[PDB]
Amino acid sequence: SNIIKQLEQEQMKQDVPSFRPGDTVEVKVWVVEGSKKRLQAFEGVVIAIRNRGLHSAFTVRKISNGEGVERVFQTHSPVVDSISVKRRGAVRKAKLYYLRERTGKAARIKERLN
Amino acid sequence: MIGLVGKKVGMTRIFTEDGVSIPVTVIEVEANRVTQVKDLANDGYRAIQVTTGAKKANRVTKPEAGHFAKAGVEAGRGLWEFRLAEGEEFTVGQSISVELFADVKKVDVTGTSKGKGFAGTVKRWNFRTQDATHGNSLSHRVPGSIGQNQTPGKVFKGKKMAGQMGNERVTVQSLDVVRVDAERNLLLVKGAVPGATGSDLIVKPAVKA
Amino acid sequence: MIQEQTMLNVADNSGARRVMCIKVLGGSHRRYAGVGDIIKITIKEAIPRGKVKKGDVLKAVVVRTKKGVRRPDGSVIRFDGNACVLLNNNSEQPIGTRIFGPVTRELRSEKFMKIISLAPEVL
Amino acid sequence: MRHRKSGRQLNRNSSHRQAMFRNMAGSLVRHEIIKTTLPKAKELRRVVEPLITLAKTDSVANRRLAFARTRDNEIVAKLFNELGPRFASRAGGYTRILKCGFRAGDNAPMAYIELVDR
Amino acid sequence: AVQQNKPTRSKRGMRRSHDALTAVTSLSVDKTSGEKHLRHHITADGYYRGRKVIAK
Amino acid sequence: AAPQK
RNA sequence: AGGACCGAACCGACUAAUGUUGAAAAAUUAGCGGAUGACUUGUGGCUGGGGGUGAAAGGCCAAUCAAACCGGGAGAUAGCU
RNA sequence: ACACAGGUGGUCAGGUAGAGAAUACCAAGGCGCUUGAGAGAACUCGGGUGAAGGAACUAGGCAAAAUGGUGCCGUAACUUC
RNA sequence: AAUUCCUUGUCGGGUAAGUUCCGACCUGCACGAAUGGCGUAAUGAUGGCCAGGCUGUCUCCACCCGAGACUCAGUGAAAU
RNA sequence: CGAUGUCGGCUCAUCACAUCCUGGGGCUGAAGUAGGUCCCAAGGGUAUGGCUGUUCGCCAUUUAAAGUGGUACGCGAGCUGGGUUUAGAACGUCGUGAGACAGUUCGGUCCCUAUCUGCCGUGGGCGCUGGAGAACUGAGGGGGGCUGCUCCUAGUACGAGAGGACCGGAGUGGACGCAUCACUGGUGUUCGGGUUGUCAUGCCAAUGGCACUGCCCGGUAGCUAAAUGCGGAAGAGAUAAGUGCUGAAAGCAUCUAAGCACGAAACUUGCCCCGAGAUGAGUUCUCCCUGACCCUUUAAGGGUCCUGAAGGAACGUUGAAGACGACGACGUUGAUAGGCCGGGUGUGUAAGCGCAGCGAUGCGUUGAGCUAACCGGUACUAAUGAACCGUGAGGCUUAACCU
Ligand SMILES: COC(=O)c1c(OC)cc2cc3c(c(O)c2c1C)C(=O)[C@]1(OC)C(=O)C=C(OC)[C@@H](O)[C@]1(O)C3=O
Ligand SMILES: [K+]
Ligand SMILES: [K+]
Ligand SMILES: [K+]
Ligand SMILES: [K+]
Ligand SMILES: [K+]
Ligand SMILES: [K+]
Ligand SMILES: [K+]
Ligand SMILES: [K+]
Ligand SMILES: [K+]
Ligand SMILES: [K+]
Ligand SMILES: [K+]
Ligand SMILES: [K+]
Ligand SMILES: [K+]
Ligand SMILES: [K+]
Ligand SMILES: [K+]
Ligand SMILES: [K+]
Ligand SMILES: [K+]
Ligand SMILES: [K+]
Ligand SMILES: [K+]
Ligand SMILES: [K+]
Ligand SMILES: [K+]
Ligand SMILES: [K+]
Ligand SMILES: [K+]
Ligand SMILES: [Mg+2]
Ligand SMILES: [Mg+2]
Ligand SMILES: [Mg+2]
Ligand SMILES: [Mg+2]
Ligand SMILES: [Mg+2]
Ligand SMILES: [Mg+2]
Ligand SMILES: [Mg+2]
Ligand SMILES: [Mg+2]
Ligand SMILES: [Mg+2]
Ligand SMILES: [Mg+2]
Ligand SMILES: [Mg+2]
Ligand SMILES: [Mg+2]
Ligand SMILES: [Mg+2]
Ligand SMILES: [Mg+2]
Ligand SMILES: [Mg+2]
Ligand SMILES: [Mg+2]
Ligand SMILES: [Mg+2]
Ligand SMILES: [Mg+2]
Ligand SMILES: [Mg+2]
Ligand SMILES: [Mg+2]
Ligand SMILES: [Mg+2]
Ligand SMILES: [Mg+2]
Ligand SMILES: [Mg+2]
Ligand SMILES: [Mg+2]
Ligand SMILES: [Mg+2]
Ligand SMILES: [Mg+2]
Ligand SMILES: [Mg+2]
Ligand SMILES: [Mg+2]
Ligand SMILES: [Mg+2]
Ligand SMILES: [Mg+2]
Ligand SMILES: [Mg+2]
Ligand SMILES: [Mg+2]
Ligand SMILES: [Mg+2]
Ligand SMILES: [Mg+2]
Ligand SMILES: [Mg+2]
Ligand SMILES: [Mg+2]
Ligand SMILES: [Mg+2]
Ligand SMILES: [Mg+2]
Ligand SMILES: [Mg+2]
Ligand SMILES: [Mg+2]
Ligand SMILES: [Mg+2]
Ligand SMILES: [Mg+2]
Ligand SMILES: [Mg+2]
Ligand SMILES: [Mg+2]
Ligand SMILES: [Mg+2]
Ligand SMILES: [Mg+2]
Ligand SMILES: [Mg+2]
Ligand SMILES: [Mg+2]
Ligand SMILES: [Mg+2]
Ligand SMILES: [Mg+2]
Ligand SMILES: [Mg+2]
Ligand SMILES: [Mg+2]
Ligand SMILES: [Mg+2]
Ligand SMILES: [Mg+2]
Ligand SMILES: [Mg+2]
Ligand SMILES: [Mg+2]
Ligand SMILES: [Mg+2]
């Protein structure tokens, strides 16, 4: 629909970087503790990307304090302040859900050197 | 207070500056033309009849074509009536825009729900299924008992049974208006409203307060 | 999405290791406990000399779930496991002195502020 | 429910549908007109016309791709050496369906389907 | 289940009152061949809308 | 054969 | 070596579903048990009705068994419908 | 009783994989099972997948799901050794 | 207790909760020595109970793939 | 007794009120909180497990509460078959025995294609008085009605203290219901990829068939819940128990006799849906038809010629509509469906060629190639000129206007 895609275009961010699954990403998100506002960083491997325009989302997996955590970020949400690619992963698949069944040295991702 | 007739364009999302995501239905509300006005003298009740959109001239039958000509307006896709409260007055050929809702906080939206065809009692009425496996014979999604023995010896009216589901008029009440874009004839309302995309909607100011 | 018969890990040093949910409190016919819901639990496994022993019946608060929690922008946080903190039946204050693994801001309320103060991380 | 779904099951399993249309498409290329039931004709459009579009650009990659679908080198040959050159300028609509009464033995509605520039 | 009483020839006929066929409302005449045919169907000699579509 | 009263 | 083990042919029939005016007056499908032995199977023979045979269930003796089938006594008798 | 998803002894015994007469795909050879065409409701049958939980189901883990091969390591109570 | 009516005897184990299960007591209505008593490795499509694993059995059902049911043409039953 | 299937469970319920909760009151051995007892009230609501064939009951943990009964001890042409209650076997006991036990124990075939009534849905006919297309009014009928916790008022009133409100307001939950698919997910045998065995395309390379979709990994549209929007109301009328004003009969007293006022989730409205076959068949707006002639039984009469309107149906392309009918869009004066073009999405760097390596394989061309149901366009294919049904100014009586 031309009506709706116009309503969406006026909201999308114009400066989201290129990143793809297996890249290690740092995301900074706004959090609020009453009268004060902060960024906190969430860093991990991108295991999934969903490219639905304004409804685009991506999933970051990290291990923290021994526990695996996944977070699904809405890419164009103004809660996401910044996205930064720390490292590039070489992987054959669009989705890396097999990394849920792995840990330690089995969960290593080769680097996309070239 | 009168309402307006629109079309369900679809659903999308609004992000607030403080970081909330609001689901919105997009309702297109082109200029509604008043085709007839009714009063106590001629009809015994006060109402306006409106039309909207456009219709191919080859499809407008003469009984209808003469009706719009009487008003002096072009044929829309249909005709609808709205009751008038006291102190509301309109004139034939008047055009009513989405700006009507500019001061309105909540609306009621009416539409025809999507059609499910012949639905079973589990889908239509949330009946519990019977046991899958402990020796059940041919009776997994069937209704069970439909009544009582000799007394009364009949099934009561209104017994919940399978049959047509959906494809019927539904009203959703007290939806928040998120935005009016009178420059592009859009009304955005929070949440979902009945019917498929491209279906006609009637929007009225919320009756409850 | 915890329910009766669900086994949970314990996110605290109270000495329990596995607990089973036996009642979702706070409502008639209530089906599920989410993050920050109180549950009645029973201790299925414990270390030899902790503060509590096998077969005790206590309250607990859910702090992590595999189902995760939804945030106001539609984002989701999920954990690899289900975990709870054991509480006293009467006062509902924590039994353990320290907390393990992350927790979530859903607990950031005056009732559990002690857990939020002790947690290694609040997501 | 069926809302917005496409295709026809034609009272066959999926593997049989695929084989049947592969055979029938080969026939409509070999003989530029065939007689069949009206519903099968309407589905064959969605099979044969995409092959003709592919044949409009002759390459080893496309010939192997056309072979994978038809599995007949005589059909592939005719596609690239005849039909592609014919329909080079036509923007779709390579076939025509003509309704043709009812089949004697079971009263099925029959139709002819033919290539337009026969 | 099965009937407790034999239905009448009256009740039989009422049920069958909906079984009547309908004839073709009217045939069409081909603008060149002059054969009658069903609308949107080729004529028996293989004409349609005034051109010989099949040589059969 | 059947279950009898 | 073995009334040994696993497992096809072969022999059986533990569970579930289907079927129940059946595809079938005892089956089908998916699993199941034995499978060199007190095994299984082809051809022929013998035992006859208060009799046979029975690793015994009143089980089997031609879709029939606390006494087979056919014909006769015979139109048994029926204080019953 | 049927152009009946049943029953019926012997002989022959190709290739690749495999321990194999199992199983998969094929050869020689033989068939597509004697009503079809459409549509793609409830519901019945036979199957596939399933978030979180994991017997809470039920008279009962019934039925499903799961285990499943070869080589090597290792292996308790009890015992008629 | 394949035997025990009263009886869910009483005590212990197992469970948050156990009329079933296991151990023990002896008040054995109404065990008991070849119509055998009491043990017992192995074995059993044997009865009961518990645990790990697994799971649409279930909370609570959703979707999908085939055969029917539905419409059209031909043939054409039955109980009652 | 030429058969009324018999316990419990499952599914589905429906009524009473002798009220479990929520609602309104009186008295109290009622300070507050919380209780006891009685009156009114049937709108809505009214646990999950362990044991047991169980009903029940006990126990564990909840809840505002876990009501009592009727309906063939509701419900087997709706399911089960644990128990009772056939044929096998055994125990205790009784009997010489065959056998027996309102004793125990293990095993043990649950059939039916719906004619009628009833009920849930969906059509055809005719009627409503000339025909046709729309929009309504609303007699009447149905759905809905639940309730916790926190905070403020207020640590106030009350109380020695402990403890701790009424009335009123706000927020946020549980169960239930409607809608929807933007989000998070499921599915996705019609999209892409990996891979085992074997057969084939002459062979290599590349592909295709079969093996449950062979096994698997992702996934578009649609559908969908665990996902996310909304709902229960406020208000009004007349009242129940109850509380009163003025007031005699009865110089007083008295809510009642005359008169007047308050009072509940019950009743009538308010909210949502159906609805003129509402035969009592309503209303409003618009559109269409303005010819002759004969005969008999002289009428609401039959027929011949001419005429064929508005509109409808049929046919075709079809749909978020659908079992079939029906309903909606479109039919060249056209985006209805398919194809095609561009995009998006999904998968994940195709084939061929070149280079490196002994080879498996890697790298370059290359985020390439392919890509269903999606989005925006485009007459390339199919949606024909017709024909068919439907008529020709629409009874009588009376009244009021106009003539
Ligand atoms: C209370 O119990 C019953 O309600 C009941 C029952 O409930 C499931 C099943 C059956 C089953 C049967 C019988 C029953 O009596 C029976 C009864 C009473 C028979 O008598 C039978 O009838 C052909 C027969 O003639 C000879 C036989 O054994 C000698 C049986 O095997 C028989 O064949 C059969 O199937
Ligand atoms: K215990
Ligand atoms: K022999
Ligand atoms: K005899
Ligand atoms: K159909
Ligand atoms: K005894
Ligand atoms: K056995
Ligand atoms: K009787
Ligand atoms: K009360
Ligand atoms: K009281
Ligand atoms: K009530
Ligand atoms: K009842
Ligand atoms: K019963
Ligand atoms: K009956
Ligand atoms: K009747
Ligand atoms: K009601
Ligand atoms: K969705
Ligand atoms: K989806
Ligand atoms: K292959
Ligand atoms: K007085
Ligand atoms: K209320
Ligand atoms: K009417
Ligand atoms: K390449
Ligand atoms: K791509
Ligand atoms: Mg529909
Ligand atoms: Mg059966
Ligand atoms: Mg079944
Ligand atoms: Mg009656
Ligand atoms: Mg479509
Ligand atoms: Mg068929
Ligand atoms: Mg296959
Ligand atoms: Mg042996
Ligand atoms: Mg035998
Ligand atoms: Mg078998
Ligand atoms: Mg075997
Ligand atoms: Mg053995
Ligand atoms: Mg064996
Ligand atoms: Mg012999
Ligand atoms: Mg006997
Ligand atoms: Mg016999
Ligand atoms: Mg005798
Ligand atoms: Mg004599
Ligand atoms: Mg006689
Ligand atoms: Mg024969
Ligand atoms: Mg045959
Ligand atoms: Mg045969
Ligand atoms: Mg044989
Ligand atoms: Mg074989
Ligand atoms: Mg051959
Ligand atoms: Mg189907
Ligand atoms: Mg699951
Ligand atoms: Mg998945
Ligand atoms: Mg899972
Ligand atoms: Mg249980
Ligand atoms: Mg239960
Ligand atoms: Mg039990
Ligand atoms: Mg089993
Ligand atoms: Mg051991
Ligand atoms: Mg005990
Ligand atoms: Mg004992
Ligand atoms: Mg003895
Ligand atoms: Mg003796
Ligand atoms: Mg003994
Ligand atoms: Mg027929
Ligand atoms: Mg009788
Ligand atoms: Mg009362
Ligand atoms: Mg009311
Ligand atoms: Mg248990
Ligand atoms: Mg009963
Ligand atoms: Mg009954
Ligand atoms: Mg039994
Ligand atoms: Mg049984
Ligand atoms: Mg008997
Ligand atoms: Mg039955
Ligand atoms: Mg009404
Ligand atoms: Mg979508
Ligand atoms: Mg997904
Ligand atoms: Mg899949
Ligand atoms: Mg090769
Ligand atoms: Mg083959
Ligand atoms: Mg155009």
Name the nearest CA neighbour of E45 among E37, D38, D108, D104. Answer: E37
Q: What's C37's domain CATH number? A: 2.40.150.20
Q: Which residue is nearest to nucleotide J316 (CA to C1')?
A: E40
Residue B152, preceding peptide bond in cis (omega within 30° of 0)? yes
Residue count of chain C, please give it. 123
Count of domains observed in chain E: 1
User: Which among D99, D101, D112 is the nearest to E54, CB-wise?
Assistant: D112
Contact between C39 and C33 under an 8 Å Cβ cutoff? The reply is: yes
Contact between C24 and C4 under an 8 Å Cβ cutoff? The reply is: yes
Tell me the β-bridge partners of C87: C59, C94
> Exposure of B206 by Cβ count < 10 A (0-12 exposed, 13-18 middle, 19+ buried)?
middle
d(CA C77, CA C70): 7
> φ and ψ at D41, to 5 degrees?
-60, -45
Range of the domain at E52: 1-56
Contact between A2 and A67 under an 8 Å Cβ cutoff? The reply is: no
> Exposure of E14 by Cβ count < 10 A (0-12 exposed, 13-18 middle, 19+ buried)?
exposed
Specify the long-range contacts of residues B179-185, CB closer than 8 Å, at least 24 apart: B179/B14, B179/B24, B180/B98, B180/B99, B180/B101, B180/B102, B181/B98, B182/B97, B182/B98, B182/B99, B182/B102, B184/A3, B185/B28, B185/B29, B185/B30, B185/B31, B185/B97, B185/B98
Name the nearest CA neighbour of A11 among C111, B17, B202. Answer: B17
Q: Tell me which residues have their CB closer than 6 angstroms to ligand 1.
A: F 1, 3-4
CA of C8 to C1' of I46 (A): 40
Is it the case that chain F and chain E have 3 or more CB pairs lying under 8 Å apart?
A: no
Instruction: Express the helix, strand and coil content of chain E in percent, nearest 5 each.
Output: 15, 15, 70
Ligand 1: residue whose CA is nearest its atom 27: F1
> Strands (DSSP E) along A5-113, which ranges?
24-33, 36-50, 57-64, 67-74, 80-87
d(CA B35, CA B71): 5
Range list of H helices, chain D: 14-30, 38-55, 60-70, 73-78, 84-86
d(CA D104, CA E48): 21
For chain E, the first-to-last Cα distance in angstroms comes to 55
Ligand 1: residue whose CA is nearest its atom 5: F3
Q: What is the DSSP string of D51-83?
A: HHHHHTS--HHHHHHHHHHH--HHHHHHIIIII
Task: Give the pair of three-digit tokens for residue E30.
Answer: 């081909």
d(CA B122, CA E50): 56
d(CA C20, CA C2): 10
Count of domains observed in chain C: 1
Those residues with Cβ within 8 angstroms of residue E33's Cβ, 6 or more apart along the chain or in another chain: E43, E45, E47, E50
Q: Give me the resolution in angstroms, 1 decimal.
A: 2.7
d(CA B187, CA B27): 5
Contact between D115 and D30 under an 8 Å Cβ cutoff? The reply is: no
CA of A69 to C1' of J229 (A): 30
d(CA A7, CA A54): 10
Those residues with Cβ within 8 angstroms of residue B160's Cβ, 6 or more apart along the chain or in another chain: B121, B124, B125, B127
Strands B47-51 and B32-38: antiparallel
Strands A67-74 and A80-87: unpaired
The distance of A22 to chain B (nearest Cα, Å) reads: 28
Contact between D26 and D34 under an 8 Å Cβ cutoff? The reply is: no
Those residues with Cβ within 8 angstroms of residue B81's Cβ, 6 or more apart along the chain or in another chain: B38, B47, B48, B49, B50
Task: Give the pair of three-digit tokens for residue C59.
Answer: 């309250």
Distances (CA, A) of D42 to B9, D87, D99, D104, E54: 31, 20, 11, 21, 19
Neighbours of A40 (CB within 10 A): 13
Look-up of token digits 């592939």: D76
Any chain C CB within 8 A of the CB of B18? no
Task: Give the pair of three-digit tokens for residue C87.
Answer: 């509480």
Please give the distance, rounded to the nearest whole angstrom, from the Cα atom of residue C3 to the centre of ligand 51. Answer: 15
Range of the domain at C50: 1-123
Contact between C11 and C100 under an 8 Å Cβ cutoff? The reply is: yes
Task: Give the pair of three-digit tokens for residue C23.
Answer: 């009642």
d(CA A7, CA A4): 5
Task: Give the pair of three-digit tokens for residue C103.
Answer: 């927790």
Range list of H helices, chain C: 113-118
Residue count of chain F, please give it. 5
> Exposure of D108 by Cβ count < 10 A (0-12 exposed, 13-18 middle, 19+ buried)?
middle
Chains within contact range of chain F (3+ C-beta pairs < 8 Å): none
Name the nearest CA neighbour of B22 among A78, A53, C35, A33. Answer: A78
Please give the distance, rounded to the nearest whole angstrom, from the Cα atom of residue F1 to the centre of ligand 33. Answer: 24
Atom number of ligand 1 nearest to Cα F3: 4
Encoded amino acid at C7, one letter: M
Residues around the ion ligand 25 (C-beta < 5 A): B 115
d(CA B33, CA B79): 10
Please give the distance, rounded to the nearest whole angstrom, from the Cα atom of residue B140 to the centre of ligand 27. Answer: 7
Query: Is residue E53 helix, strand or coil?
Result: coil
d(CA B88, CA C55): 73
CA of D112 to C1' of J385 (A): 24
| Residue B132 DSSP one-character state | S
Residues around the ion ligand 31 (C-beta < 5 A): D 15
> φ and ψ at E18, to 5 degrees?
-100, -5
